[PDB]
Amino acid sequence: SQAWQPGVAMPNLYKMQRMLLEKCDLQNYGENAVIPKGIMMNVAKYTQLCQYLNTLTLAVPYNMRVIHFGAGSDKGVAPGTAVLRQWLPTGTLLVDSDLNDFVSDADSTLIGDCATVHTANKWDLIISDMYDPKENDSKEGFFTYLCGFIKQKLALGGSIAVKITEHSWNADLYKLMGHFSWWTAFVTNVNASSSEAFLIGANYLGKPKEQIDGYTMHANYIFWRNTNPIQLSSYSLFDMSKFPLKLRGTAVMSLKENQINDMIYSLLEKGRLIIRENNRVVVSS
Amino acid sequence: STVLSFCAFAVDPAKAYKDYLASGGQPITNCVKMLCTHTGTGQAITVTPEANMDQESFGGASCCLYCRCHIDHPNCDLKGKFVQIPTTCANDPVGFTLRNTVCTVCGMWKGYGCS
Ligand SMILES: Nc1ncnc2c1ncn2[C@@H]1O[C@H](CSCC[C@H](N)C(=O)O)[C@@H](O)[C@H]1O
Ligand SMILES: [Cl-]
Ligand SMILES: [Cl-]
Ligand SMILES: [Cl-]
Ligand SMILES: [Cl-]
Ligand SMILES: [Cl-]
Ligand SMILES: [Mg+2]
Ligand code: NA
Ligand code: NA
Ligand code: NA
Ligand SMILES: [Zn+2]
Ligand SMILES: [Zn+2]
C-alpha cells in the first residue's frame, strides 16, 4: 500500500511527541536505484512532490502565482522547474531563483542570493529546494529570508513546500507551519533513504492555529525517520495520467483585516479562497 | 565536456556543434527528460508534455543550444515549453532540435511524424 504512494507523510502520532534531539541514522547519499533510466533524481523527486500536493486542498486561482527557490542544479538546468511547468495550469506565472546562473523554463529567472529577491506582489505557492552543503542547531541564512518571505509575500490560502534535512532546518519555519490550516513533513518514495523531507504548509492563515516549538518538532521529525525505515519506491512514477494540478478556479479577493471574519477563515482553511491583490507582478534583483 | 564553451566561442555555434560531434565528441548531456503518459498528440513543441509512444518529452530550455551556451539566439521557441524527441534520437536532443524543422501545418517534425 505504502509503496504505491508518491511518498510518506509524518504521522500525527509523531508530530504530537516531545522528543529530545538525536542524531539521524540516515545518509543523504545513495545509488538510487529506483530512478528510471534517463530520469534525473530531481525530476522524480518533484514529480512525487506534486503527486502528493494533488491530494491536498491547494487553492488554484485562474491566474496562479508560483515562486521556486533554489531551482538551479550544478548541471546548469532546472529539472524541478520543468516538473512545475508540466504540473501547473497553462499560463500560471512561474518564477524561479538560484544563487548561480542556470537555464530555465520559468517565465522569469532571478540570479543571486535569495535575499536580493524583492517583490511587492503576493504568491499562491512557494517551493524551495534551497540547501547549503558539533551541535545541530537551527540554521539561519536562506531560512531567515524564507520565513520573512512567507510572512510578507504569501497570500492567505496559499501553500508552501520547503526542503529540509537533518542538518538543514530552521526552528522558526517549523513554528510557522502552525500558521497553516494543515502541515506535514513529506518524504518522497524515490529519496526515502535520505533524511530529506519537504515541509508542506497547506492553506496559509496568517496567524497561529497551533503552538509549535521548532526545536522540539525537528527532534520529533528525526525520531520518526530513525524508527520508521522507508523502502525506496518509484511505483507512482509509472502512472502519470492524472498528474496536472486540478483547475479549481479558486476565488481571489482583496479583503481588509476587519473583513476577514470566521466565515472567511473557514473558506481559507478549506482551500476555497486566496486573499491578495491582483496588480501587475514585478520581481527583480 | 567543454562542448558548451567550444560552441559559445564559435562564429557559427550550430556548425561548431556539428563539427564537435563529427570529431567523436559526446552529445550535450543533462537535457531534462520528463515522466509522461506517452499518449500525447506527438507534436514537436508544446505547452505540456505531448510525447506519443515513439517519443520522449524534454523541458525545452535544456534542449536549446543557445540557452545551454548562454549566447544570443539566431532570431526562443523551446524555452518555457516542452519538446518531443523521437526515442531513437533522444540521446542527442540539442542536436535533434538544431538539425530538424517543425512543419508549419501539422506541427510535427518534418521527416519523423509529419504527413
Ligand atoms: N542562500 C541561497 N540563496 C540562493 N540559492 C541557494 C542558497 N543556498 C542554496 N541555494 C541553492 O540550492 C540548490 C541546492 S540543489 C537544488 C537542485 C535544483 N532544485 C534542481 O532542480 O536541480 C543550489 O542550486 C543552490 O544554488
Ligand atoms: Cl497524481
Ligand atoms: Cl489538505
Ligand atoms: Cl512542538
Ligand atoms: Cl467557491
Ligand atoms: Cl549537428
Ligand atoms: Mg482541510
Ligand atoms: Na493553497
Ligand atoms: Na543533512
Ligand atoms: Na524549547
Ligand atoms: Zn533557447
Ligand atoms: Zn506536416
Residue numbers in the entry:
A (entry chain A): 2 to 134, 141 to 292
B (entry chain B): 11 to 85, 90 to 129
What did the original publication write about this model?
The SARS-CoV RNA cap 2′-O-MTase is a heterodimer comprising SARS-CoV nsp10 and nsp16. Nsp16 is unstable in solution, and nsp10 acts as a scaffold for nsp16, yielding a stable dimer active as an RNA cap-dependent (nucleoside-2′-O)-MTase. The nsp10/nsp16 crystal structure shows that nsp16 adopts a typical fold of the S-adenosylmethionine-dependent methyltransferase family as defined initially for the catechol O-MTase. When bound to nsp10, nsp16 is active as a type-0 RNA cap-dependent 2′-O-MTase, ie., active only when the cap guanine is methylated at its N7 position.
The Y96 position is of particular interest. Alanine substitution (Y96A) abrogates interaction whereas a phenylalanine (Y96F) increases both interaction and MTase activity. In order to understand how residue 96 plays such a pivotal role, we determined at 2.0 Å resolution the crystal structure of this nsp10(Y96F)/nsp16 complex. Strikingly, the absence of the hydroxyl group does not alter the topology of the interface. Wild-type and Y96F residues superimpose without significant difference at all atomic positions (not shown). Either Y96 or F96 is in direct contact with nsp16 helix αZ, which carries the catalytic residue K46. Detailed surface analysis using PISA indicates that the position of K46 in Y96F nsp10 is identical to that of K46 in wild-type nsp10, ruling out a better alignment of catalytic residues of the Y96F mutant. The nsp10(Y96F)/nsp16 differs from wild-type nsp10/nsp16 in the SAH binding site, though. When compared to that of wild-type, the SAH occupancy is much lower (∼0.3 versus ∼1), leading to poor density definition. We thus attribute the increased activity of the nsp10(Y96F)/nsp16 complex relative to wild-type to a stronger equilibrium association of nsp10(Y96F) with nsp16 than that of wild-type nsp10 with nsp16.
